[model samples]
Target: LHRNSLIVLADVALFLALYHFLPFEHNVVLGISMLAFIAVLWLTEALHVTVTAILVPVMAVFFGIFETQAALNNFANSIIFLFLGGFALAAAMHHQGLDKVIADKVLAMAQGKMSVAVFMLFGVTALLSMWISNTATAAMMLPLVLGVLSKVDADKQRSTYVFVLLGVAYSASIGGIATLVGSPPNAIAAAEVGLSFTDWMKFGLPTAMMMLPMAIAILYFLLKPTLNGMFELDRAPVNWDKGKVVTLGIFGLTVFLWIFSSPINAALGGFKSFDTLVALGAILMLSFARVVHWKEIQKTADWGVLLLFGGGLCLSNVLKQTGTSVFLANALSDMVSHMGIFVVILVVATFVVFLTEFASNTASAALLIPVFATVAEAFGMSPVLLSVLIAVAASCAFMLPVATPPNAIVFASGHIKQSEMMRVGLYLNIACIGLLTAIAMLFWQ
Candidate 1:
């Protein structure tokens, strides 16, 4: 245990080294230093994940990267509630046995083939995330995966649990790459690059198509989750109770609001955090109506995971504010200017995907968008192409749980270890570096 402090010292050394000599603004150095320091703590898991996550804002404020309130305010970001509401809903479903009913239907469709069931989990999870937010999609899908796991013989279920949970988590992220509204980074790029809905779909649909099969193959051949017999054969039949209907109605309205928040937001003029509020309201209704017990929600909730997403957002805002985005973009613009256009696009794609493995995708994409737009302008290229490349690459990062919300959700499940995730995630990230670049070079207009 005492040996772990070596990582702490090394973290301090790295931060101080960067802070003292970086050829950038003071805040840029501070932000990057704090970022490096926090990342080291997280990567090593020396400190608790939530502890490190919660520490970011205070560090940000201490280093003068943000005002105290501004830094602390990130915890209340709408996306955090998306995490909370999703878990609360999952708790509701589990208490009502709806998760099992849902799982049973999926297993029935697969007809007892473990491989086919995994593929379906990946596919449907991906499909839902293309429309619903990835955070919510993973939150909603995970309970079903857990419900299925509850049926498996505990001794035999280790690898099976990892692949199933990771499948939904990764698929939710991949699906979020498929549409303009699927992920925050996608919309960030769309606004900066001036992409229409159809125009954005042109890039996203192809990237999602190529990556979906790749993700499934990684889970299938690499993880090799085995379940020789029927899950239903091990457990009792689903109850199909009255609670499912009540829970569904509340959640159905929540889903509808998320999809229509823009139109509804316009109608209300300013229902701030409207989409987020709708989700939280579902939890309130579910609890008050006795559709699910308050104790159940608390029991299932992952508050640490809420801090996980919020901390990323905090660091993301800091990096964006402190000019790290522009610093990296202009540096890239200069370095790649002499290369061929295809090579430049490839470089950008590779860079964004890898950077996002550690940084929040929304932060990475938002930070780079405007600066890359400038890069495009200087080079006589389409800013839309460059920005879309960043957006797609942002979701392609699979190496770490901090890379995206979907990754965090699965990691928080206590099934997959960081080393295991990194190994498979490394393979996917490397493949996507080329796959995404090629899509942009060949098909993007």
Candidate 2:
């Protein structure tokens, strides 16, 4: 108790010191200091994330950093609703067992080809991750991977099993980079930098596509000797009844609208924000049809994550309001003035990648992207591109089991060791850093 208390007291002390001593306006200092307070608590997890999230607006108002209305407004932002809709939709799919059916079908196709199976598993997991939560994807797919592993003789092919486990876990993070709803950082970037689905797909999809192949090849080559020769799958007959059909139908339409809404609007000569609503509509369709129940919603939806997004938005707004973003950006610009634009982006991306390995990627993006976006603007560059770099890099934490949910989920299976993961993850992390930085500089502009 005393140790935890000291940590809390130290957080407050640091906050007060920064508030008074930072060479900025009072509101800016307050905003930055509040971020520090919440960040420290988030990193240490001394307080529940939701509790700290709820304190955002309360602290903002109490410190006179922002008005109650403006500070609290972000909680109701369309982005939050967008994620809520996503959570509900994903929950429905899980309840309907649609995700498993998809994974099982894909796995069955690659049964005899060891390389193909690994690649297919990684690809399927990544694709699913583009629309679902990475944690959910990891959890849902792990059993399938393990079932396949069960066919391999554990005494001889244990390393091969570990490689498959790592592939699934790593691919989960890789795929979530492909779309806005795939990960929190993606949505956070969208909310802050105004990226639409088309904008994200244009920049993010190519990167994810490139990384998917590169990741599979890297794992295959690195763990080639350990890969078990071949395996068979007793494919189960899928009962594609009404519930599965409706769930798949809703899933397909939701994705279609999210991706094609802008183009459809342009062609039709109408402007309507239908993407977020499509997500909620899918949920309602599923729930009303009894495909998913209220208890399932409560069990499946991650309410804390939504709250974290809200808190991050509130802080981001305050940073913009108080000119803290500009101040921090200017300071950062001075430090990176000697480097070219590509080098600067690489530096920022690398910083976020390593930072995310230790901290919550959501909190890390929320804490840094606003500042980086301002820096990009100060340099007369595209904040959207820079935000994309930061957002994508935030999801590239693969070096430690604690780095991401997929990694943690895989670790919990008790088949892989930390040392083995670190060995492979290190190379993957370096590869992702190079790939993301190069792609961002070349195409994201």
Candidate 3:
């Protein structure tokens, strides 16, 4: 409580300082002030994320950061519907236990080998993430992973299972990077360029494939020292229920539709992208399937999260309109004069990490990309290069639980400590940047 009070005080103090000392236009000053305030709220966890997010538009209105009308429109952004459909689809998967079923079957196939079990769950989360919310992906797998961990003897090899639990969290994030709907930044990037979901798969799949193995390898290395400390490699097979073949049928159908929806769209000359159709169609199937029970679609979905994303989209829109993002780009470039493209990538990625540690990833992505886009243009580089940099960089939601939903969820498990996560996470963060940087610089051309 005391700490949170200090954070709120600091934020108000900083905003007041800006209001006094900065000879700033209302919009630009308000934009920066809004960002600082959100960061403070996030670090303090003083309110619900959606509640804090709602303040974006309120701040925009009071400081004239954007037209009150325009900022309000951010709540109704297309991305909100996109998120709504996405979350609803994930709700079906959760309702049908598709995610858990898959995790169970794959872990069974792992035959109780610690390494294989970890890798399998990681792969499962990653693949699912390529399609749905990474946070949702992790949520679906969390219970199953915990159940399996509980079955293992604690005095025996616990480190392997513990790290494997962490691996599931990391894999969801890595997986979320695979496609446009996989992460918020990808969607924001798509919105920026008017690119569709298929467009994301075309360009991003290659990068996803390259980095996924590296992500798995990084987890292994990070946990190597303590992997066998308490984790037992050998265990007896655990019995589980058979797959819901009908539910699995619908799940398979959803995947097939996603992979083929673009072609279907092209064949019919429809403008809607595959992700949209996939989201729409998947929701329909979930609603209609007689064998698969579902609650009212709204009951299972996360409207607050969708609202949060909408707020982020609006915040980005306002930041750009206010010229704050542009000014930031100029200031950042001035600080890194004579830097090469590689240096720029590293700097952007690092800055993204630093900022995300203190703010929401969606907000971090929304705010930072416009800055990078402007700076890239000024530096005579391709915007696509910077777009990829921002997309991947924005999803590096490590270093703290407040950084991402999945991080917070897994941290709540209490089996892991913050310092322990940081110990492992810092290395994972470094490894991710190294791997993503190499792949981006090499293949993005």
Candidate 4:
């Protein structure tokens, strides 16, 4: 415990020391100091993540971090609404038993070889993650995966579990890049940088398309050497239900509505948002289909999760209002101006990815996007371009147990050791850094 505390303290120190170099307006030093202090509290997990998240903005308001209106805007942002609707849709699907059915079908189809099975598992989980939260996907798939591992009797089912959990977590994080409502970090970036949902899709979709395939490949290769057994001859037959087909179809249509919310609202900028529409649709589905009642939705939707995401957004907003973003941007511009353009992009992108390993991706990006946007403006480069690179980087939290919730959820089994997580996570981390940098340098310019 002492060692863990020291590690936490050291992390706080390193983060704060970097915070000092950022450029800001008056009382900037005090602002950075407060953020560092709050972050230290965050490291201990002493409070609920939501409480710590709420504390950031709350202090900002009391300590003059930002005006009350700016701080509270996070709660009102369309992104928060997006989460509201999306999670409702997810709840509907969960109650309908669609997620499990989908998982079973995907796993069943990957029947030929161990490598093929692993690849399919990762692919399906990642695809599911684009819509469902990573932890949800992992939980839905975990029992089935356990059954498979038991049958295969693989020496490294443990390693496979790590990769599978990561596929779900990282993919959900990455999939959000494809759509505005995919993840909190993307929403935070949109809110912080004045980006609309459609605008974000324009910037994020291409990069996400390129990265998902590459991410799957990198993950598979990392877990390949650890596979020590084959599939069982007496594998149990998968159960199939027709109602799941209809439910998944509805879920897919919801994605279509989310992606095309802009085009759908071509004339009126004030059309009801996709989130509200989805929420209404979910209600109708539940009532029409009788899938889940009030009690079920309440149980499935997770009030704690709602608070965490909502509070995290609000906290991140404080950083925005306090001129913290501008300060960090100026500091980066001064430092990176001396380096080559390619180096600047690579370094900035790489930093976003690594930073997420410790902090919440949404919080990190909330702090970084404004700073990077300022850097881009100062350098006379494309701010939108920087936004895209950093956006992906923030979601690239593949290393360490602390990096993502799914990683921790899977780790909870205690089957996989820390040394193993580091081994696989470290390699995947480097792979993502390289892949994202190359994509940014080659295609995005």
Of the candidates shown, which would achieve the greatest lDDT relative to the real structure? 2
TM-score of each: 0.66, 0.93, 0.81, 0.78
Model 4 vs truth, CA RMSD: 4.7
The sequence of per-residue lDDT tens digits that candidate 2 reaches over residues 1-445 is: 5776788899999998997898877877877888789888877767766778788889888877789888878877677777777777777778788888888778677757676777788889998898778898999888778767777776767678787888898788988898888798888888887777667878888988998778767877877535546767665647567788887887787788878888776787664456666667777887877888878777877888788778888877777777777777677776667677788777888888878888878878876777677656766776887788888888888878888888898999887777777877778778888998788767756
Task: By TM-score, rank the candidates, best first.
Answer: 2, 3, 4, 1
- lDDT tens readout by residue for model 1, 1-445: 4656888888889998998988888876886687678767766666766778788888887876789888877677665665467667767766776655765666678766665776777787776676546786788778667766676765656778878887788888888888655576776665555454445666788789889898878777887777664543455657566879888777777767766776877898877667567777877888887987767777767666566556766766776688765565576666676677788777888888888898767656655665576546555576888888888888776888887778888888787878878988888887888787777767774
Model 4 residue pairs with clashes: 23-327
Q: How close is candidate 3 to the true structure, as a TM-score?
A: 0.81
Q: Predict model 3's lDDT versus the native.
A: 0.68
RMSD of each: 6.6, 2.1, 4.3, 4.7
lDDT agreement with native, every candidate: 0.73, 0.79, 0.68, 0.64
Model 2, clash count? 0
For every model shown, the clashing-pair count is 0, 0, 6, 1
Looking at candidate 3, what is the lDDT of residue 406? 88
Model 3 over residues 1-445: C-alpha lDDT tens digits?
Answer: 5876777788889888876777777777876777677766744566666777787788777765578787777676555565556666566656666666666668777655654566677888898897667787888788767665665555555565557667778778878877766687787676654566656677777766776677666656766524322223243444434435655666677656666766777887775555566666666776676533446456756667666666666666766777777677677676667676687777777777666766767656665565566555555665676776677777876678877788888877766667767777677677767766776688774
lDDT of 4 at 35: 56
- Give the CA lDDT, 0 to 100, for residue 332 in model 2: 71
CA lDDT, candidate 2, residue 129: 93
> Measured by TM-score, how close is model 1 to the native structure?
0.66
